Amino acid sequence: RTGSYGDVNRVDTTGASSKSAKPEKLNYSGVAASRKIAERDLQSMDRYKALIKKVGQKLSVDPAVIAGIISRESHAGKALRNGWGDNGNGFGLMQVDRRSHKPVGEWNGERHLMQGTEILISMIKAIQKKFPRWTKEQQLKGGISAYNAGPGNVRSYERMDIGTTHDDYANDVVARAQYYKQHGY
Prior knowledge:
It is found in: Secreted. One of its GO terms (biological process) is defense response to Gram-positive bacterium. Its EC number is 3.2.1.17. Strand 2 and strand 3 form a beta hairpin. It contains eight helices and three strands; from the N terminus they run αααααβββααα. With 185 residues, the chain is mainly alpha-helical. A three-stranded antiparallel sheet has the order 1-2-3.
């Protein structure tokens, strides 16, 4: 499923920076690093695969992108403490910020995934409004970056991820997504 927000396969990526790769005990960075990390989360992700696809169907969002976010946010849950991460602010597989949203649902359930994905949509639409001369695919990458840092942070295409966690968030997520898209998402 491509979704209504652009084709993730058409988005360029430089993958995970050293800052993301090191914590995962990898001695290389880049797209292969993103792919490896995603692969490591594949079995756990696959626990949720039919829900992710329901959610992608309902919202016209690529389930691969949802997966890529989950991997990055929570390692498909493996990084959480009883549902929580981000210094106690983030909830669930997609790590919805409780400070600005009212988290709904079980940490690993459909309502949660719907919530996170609606929020993603809202970021993408923000970027579409902010940068109407970008392509849909450009806007998609920006949206994903904004999922981490807010649309305010996106002031460029090529350097959007400056100011995201590890200064690589959308690049990493896009690579993860492109991986999952090849693994049944």
